[PDB]
Amino acid sequence: TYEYILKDRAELGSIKWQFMAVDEAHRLKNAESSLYESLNSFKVANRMLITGTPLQNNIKELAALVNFLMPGRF
DNA sequence: GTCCCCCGCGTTTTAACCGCCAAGGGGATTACTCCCTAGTCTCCAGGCACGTGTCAGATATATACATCGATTAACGATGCTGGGCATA
């Protein structure tokens, strides 16, 4: 659950992970999120978001999604 | 010396907090002009100090009137008392 991520950010951060799944990943809408840089610490190799979030409402999220999957790329 | 209103403690119930994102009111900046102020001059009449003045109150004050308080001179009636007059 999304609660539990943040309540125990630390223990998962240490153990290695290389594959990520998330449900209804329109959460990462703003680039100022708490789970937005919470997820970045979890040593990871590949990610996988899966939601139908429309990506023209704001250009922020369109960019946020691109920045989050690939840190660096417009 | 008595009684019952707080503390400690287990469990049940609400809402504080954190995270996230949105949206617009209102505060912050800037530019221009124009009213309102300090600064400066002259003047006096406003203001300060004081002598002069008749009117509120307050205090007797000479003069007069009314009412007794008390005293003294005067008047009505004696009471033994003293100084003499008719009878045992």
Curated annotation (Swiss-Prot):
The 2 chromodomains are involved in the binding to the histone H3 methyllysine at position 4 (H3K4me3). The CHD1 helical C-terminal domain (CHCT) binds DNA and nucleosomes. A motif (DEAH box) lies at residues 23-26. Present with 1620 molecules/cell in log phase SD medium. It comes from Saccharomyces cerevisiae (strain ATCC 204508 / S288c). Belongs to the SNF2/RAD54 helicase family. The gene is CHD1. Disruption phenotype: Decreased sensitivity to the cytotoxic effects of 6-azauracil. Component of the 1.8 MDa SAGA complex, which consists of at least of TRA1, CHD1, SPT7, TAF5, ADA3, SGF73, SPT20/ADA5, SPT8, TAF12, TAF6, HFI1/ADA1, UBP8, GCN5, ADA2, SPT3, SGF29, TAF10, TAF9, SGF11 and SUS1. TAF5, TAF6, TAF9, TAF19, TAF12 and ADA1 seem to be present in 2 copies. SAGA is built of 5 distinct domains with specialized functions. Domain I (containing TRA1) probably represents the activator interaction surface. ATP-dependent chromatin-remodeling factor which functions as substrate recognition component of the transcription regulatory histone acetylation (HAT) complexes SAGA and SLIK. It recognizes H3K4me. SAGA is involved in RNA polymerase II-dependent transcriptional regulation of approximately 10% of yeast genes. At the promoters, SAGA is required for recruitment of the basal transcription machinery. It is found in: Nucleus. This is Chromo domain-containing protein 1.
